[model samples]
Target: PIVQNLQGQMVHQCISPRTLNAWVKVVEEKAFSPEVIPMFSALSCGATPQDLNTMLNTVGGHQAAMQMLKETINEEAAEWDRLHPVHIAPGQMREPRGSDIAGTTSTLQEQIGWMTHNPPIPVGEIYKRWIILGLNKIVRMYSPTSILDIRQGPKEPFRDYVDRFYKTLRAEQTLLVQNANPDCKTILKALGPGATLEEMMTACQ
Candidate 1:
């Protein structure tokens, strides 16, 4: 692309879905493989391997691509429904149908690109509220009632293992201020004998 200045005069082609279908038909009638085309070339609305293949098959038989497209749109629709199970529509339909729920809601967006795969996730404006509610409900729904009732991660390196404990302690004690929230009093309290932090600081010494 930087070599554009070094390159000769050229023009790009304009094509359409109609032209795409035409091309596929000619190849098919002559008994050529549609698969003969290089893996990547240009035609578009094409984004996925699915898109490219579907676009090709769609150009010919088209069934495979359309099915893939239909399935993904369907899957994204269901993902949005995870925000709530109840039907919002005034369905005179007997019980809320799956496709009806699938029809609404933006797909989960932030769970892609960089900083992804941390799981517990994001979406759009309405989607933002819904994902938060979904994550919040999931955590509390399965959380234990008492401190003693809570189970812990299995044992590992002591220093590494101790960080979660240390981190929460500091986090509780971690203040942002020349001003305050758990405020100036909290840090002063941490150094006192009654503090868990104070107790831990001398442990194993």
Candidate 2:
């Protein structure tokens, strides 16, 4: 069982990653009080009980370890933010009004598509969709493809290209793979009947 404090309350369970990050940031800039060291250890993902004891026992070792922990937490926070960007939050101002929909049918439809979730998306749902559908060009417009392009290089061996494509699909499955449609209404609205094929093809792509 997880330990509780003097009041017999399990306080660390209430701490979010943001809160722990902030605390570690403060500890790095200033210095940690002896009392809070245990608290920090409890909240840390990379820490263990014996590690905390060692930190408590040594003087310079404590500072060095704290610095290491701070860096670890910073990387964790960076990855967390990358996976959960502020723009995709449910409370974000992505909502479309009737007036806003006049010349933006496609854009409005894209925005509304996210709200179709039964219970509504929390933080990582959009990211999950991005990973799952990242292969699709339509969704690729929404999120960049991190996997390597399979297009064979000029003067490159066909065997090498096949191996590279194999690696691409292999890494793609890790993000978890592997995956849409055109909205032509807004295109015609933007470009009138007199618009040339070149003009129409520009937006279509």
Candidate 3:
């Protein structure tokens, strides 16, 4: 009989209790929607969707299972509110410096004036990029060792977070270089070539 080691446990050809529990959890969680799962599976092998009924059945069954899980867990879903106190409002969004607008003819003063005066104003893509950059910086600072810990501090101001995040990344660059984690490279690429420290930090989580 073939045996397998999984997550530090050995198991026989027959499925172990842990494996059974994992399968149950996945089913209960609806880890993948039926329609999406088929599509994904098809994409893996370059197959086409040939059975709409089957897809629909899978989706329905998954939804039913998910509902059962929720009930069993006594889950209470939270409503999504755009104006939630913790959420950064769309209007307040700003980009990291130098990352997006470097060498541009437009001055900061001009940019501010344009934003202040324009209605139905579109925030530039550069600004969006910078915001991500800023967030990335914050992630680096507070949670230098792990992505899991990169999150907004309680009632933290967006701007303040950006500043601190960048500072942390810069301070750790020497150590990060020695460790040689690809995360640093990923961060650098995100900020673009010739991205300043401010721009890099601005890209934070």
Q: Mark the regions of model 3 whose C-alpha exceeds 4 Å error after superposition.
A: 4-12, 33-60, 63-205
Residue-level lDDT tens digits of model 1 in 1-205 = 0011235532222335674675466545532222222211333321222223334454444344335545554554566557546522352222222343222321212112111223312121222233223323333332324232222233332233244443333322222111122333344355544545334333312
Better of 2 and 3 by lDDT: 2
lDDT values, one for every candidate: 0.33, 0.37, 0.34
TM-score of each: 0.22, 0.18, 0.18
Better of 1 and 3 by lDDT: 3
Of the candidates shown, which would achieve the greatest TM-score relative to the real structure?
A: 1
lDDT of 3 by residue, 114-171 (tens): 3333351222333333323332333234343442233335555435545454444443
Question: Measured by TM-score, how close is model 3 to the native structure?
Answer: 0.18
Candidate 1's C-alpha runs over 4 A off are 1-123, 150-199, 202-205
Count the clashes in each prediction: 2, 0, 14
Lowest-scoring 10 consecutive residues by lDDT in candidate 1?
A: 106-115
